[PDB]
Structures are given as C-alpha cells and as structure tokens.
C-alpha cells in the first residue's frame, strides 16, 4: 500500500538457507552411507542413491535463484547461465523420473509378482537410470544450446527462443515440461500406489490392517509432498506464460513457490531413505 516494504525478502532468504543446507547435507549424508556401508548391490539402494544424487545437484542451483530474486539481474554472463540452467532442468527430471520409477517398482512388486523377479534386479534398476539419464540429457543439451541472457534494464537468464513470426515456442516448451515433469508423473505415481493398496486391501486379519494402515499413511505422505511442492510453481510458471503481473508480492510469491520445488528435493532423503526400513538398519 505504501513505500516502506515488508521484510518478506529477508524471510525468503532465510527459508532458502534452511531448504539449501537441509537438502545439501541430507542428500550428501544418504550417498555417503550407501557408498561406505551398503555398497548398493541391491536394486533398492541403486534408486535411493540416484535420487539422493539428483536432489543433491538440484539444491546446488538454489543460491542462484536466491541471488537473482534480490539483485533482480543476472550479471554473470551467458556461460554460467547455460551451465546453471542445464543443471536446474536435467536433475529436475532425474529427480522426478527416479521418484516415479520407485512407484512403478513398488507397483510391480505387489501387482505383478512374477514380473517383479524379472524387473527388480540390480541390472534392471541401473538400465532404468541409464534411460532416465538419456531422457534428462535431452533437456540438458537443450538448456546448454538455448540458455542465455536477454536485456528485456534488468538482465535475465532463461531459455532464449526466436520471437520472429508470431512464434510461441517459449510457451510450447513450458507446456511440455508441465506434462512430462508433473502431469504424467503425478498420474503414474497416483495410479501405481492406488492400485498397489487396492491389491493389498483385496487379501483374505490384524497383520493385514497393520501393514495397510502403515503403507496408506506412507503413500499419502510421499505423494502429498510431491503435490504440495510442485503444483504451486508449475501452475505459477504456466499462468505467467499464458498471461500475469510483475508486482512485489507477485515476485515474492514466485520465489516462495520456487523454494517449495527445492523443498521436495530436501524432504526426499527423509521421506524415502530416513524412512526406509532397510536403510536405517
């Protein structure tokens, strides 16, 4: 309403500090345990490591978001821009696709037990991550070639596209990211875990109910974290691209939604590894 601004940017810089350290320490701790003690000979630990590694590299980009919000410019050239963007995108899909194949692995484990023998092997887990490496590297190479700086008096770092001939490939790219990094994931992880519980509910007394309650609570939480963290920023980006506004509160809310996306990566070590009944022991 007035000239004096509220200390919201200080609060934002403080949340970023928590999410950054919690995420960087957490995921570095998980990898350390797997490298020095578990040796990742099982398919389970292979997923846990690759998720921890992807979430460890996504938090690496986080201080750049923090800095850009407060400075309101990218003065570090196109060379760093291309690097920071590619790391931010590549490991976003590597984080979300590993997270989704864990859902598919747990789904096949219960619903296709004979297939589980031929799918939940250390080799198969490795191949699945080699595929997740390829699918992400496509966006990674795209971020290295298209990433750059634009003068449109505050310097911006983003994927640069030609504006000629009523082009809309900036919007188009965002819709592809929205469906392959949120829509098909959310739906795959919702369908897989729902069908998984439905299978266990269809088993015929206290032992079944004890596991069903523990698993349903776990399932609700893991997807709740993915929905609570990615839904705000995916919608914000998509609506800003279809429209929106560039206010102070609108800029503050955007980087708060950015922080939520990084929160998913910071909670994954606690939600999947420091809750794994095999990783604790």
């Amino acid at each position, epitope marked *: 309403l007035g000239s004096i601004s509220p200390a919201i940017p200080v609060i934002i810089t403080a949340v970023y500090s928590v999410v950054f350290v919690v995420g960087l320490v957490g995921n570095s701790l998980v990898m350390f345990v797997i490298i020095r003690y578990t*040796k990742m000979k099982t398919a389970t630990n292979i997923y846990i490591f690759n998720l921890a590694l992807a979430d460890a590299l996504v938090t690496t980009t986080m201080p750049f978001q923090s800095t850009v919000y407060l400075m309101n410019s990218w003065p570090f050239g196109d060379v760093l821009c291309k690097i920071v963007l590619s790391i931010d995108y590549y490991n976003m899909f590597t984080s979300i696709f590993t997270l989704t194949m864990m859902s598919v692995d747990r789904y096949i484990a219960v619903c296709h*037990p004979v297939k589980a023998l*031929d799918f939940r092997t250390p080799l198969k887990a490795k191949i699945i991550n080699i595929c997740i490496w390829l699918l992400s590297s496509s966006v990674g190479i795209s971020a290295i070639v298209l990433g750059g700086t634009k003068v449109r008096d505050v310097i911006e770092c983003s994927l640069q596209f030609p504006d000629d001939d009523y082009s809309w490939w900036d919007l188009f790219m965002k819709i592809c990211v929205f469906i392959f990094a949120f829509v098909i994931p959310v739906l795959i992880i919702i369908v897989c875990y729902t069908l998984m519980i439905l299978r266990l509910k269809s088993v015929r007394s206290r032992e079944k109910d004890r596991n069903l309650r523990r698993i349903t609570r776990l399932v609700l939480v893991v997807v709740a974290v993915f929905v609570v963290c990615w839904t705000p920023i995916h919608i914000f980006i998509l609506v800003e691209a279809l429209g929106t506004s560039h206010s102070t509160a609108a800029l503050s809310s955007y980087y708060f939604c950015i922080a939520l996306g990084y929160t998913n990566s910071s909670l994954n070590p606690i939600l999947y590894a420091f809750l794994d009944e095999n990783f604790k022991r």
Partner: nanobody
Amino acid sequence: VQLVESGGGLVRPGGSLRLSCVDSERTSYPMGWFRRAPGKEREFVASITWSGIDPTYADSVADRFTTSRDVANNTLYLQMNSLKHEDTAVYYCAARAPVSPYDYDYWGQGTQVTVSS
C-alpha cells in the same frame, strides 16, 4: 504339507531356477529363504515383507537372486539366475505365523538345488 516347496533339482552352471513356496491352507506367510550347504551351517538367502514390497538380500546372492511375494496367492518366489557351484544347497522356505524382523515361525522341508554338469 504346509509350505509347498518346488522348483529345485539339477541346473547347469550359469543356469536359472525359480523356487516357489505356497501355503494354500493360509496358516502362515512364506516370507523368507535359507540354505544349508553340504558342510556349511544355515545361511540366509533373502527375505521380503508381508506386503511383498521390501526385499532383503544376502551380499553373496543379492546380485543374482531376486525374491517376490504374491500376496493374493500367498506364494513366495526366489528367482535364482547365473547359478554357481557355491549355490548347490538344500533351500528352505521360511514362513511367519499370522499372530519381529527376519525371524521365522515355520521352516520348510527343503527343495535341494544342485549346480552340476
């Protein structure tokens, strides 16, 4: 017989065997695998939770063997691939009563597995 064990016998070295243990009377849950070599003592092979989601494996066979549980048919499976002359043993099914980690209540009769020429 309570724990119905099958899928053993002779196999060529580097060959595969899918062991299966089922309790049709539903008096227990087959959730574990143990093996006893001609000389060596009782050795843990692999375990899995009631849900059939979390499979535990011994470092020795973790790389080759794969276990699964058919919650619907109350059946436990043990896929044994790239079988070496060290895997030749009597494989026992471990079942847990309906009424505590990696401890079984009902053992198996045995489904002797031989890896020879």
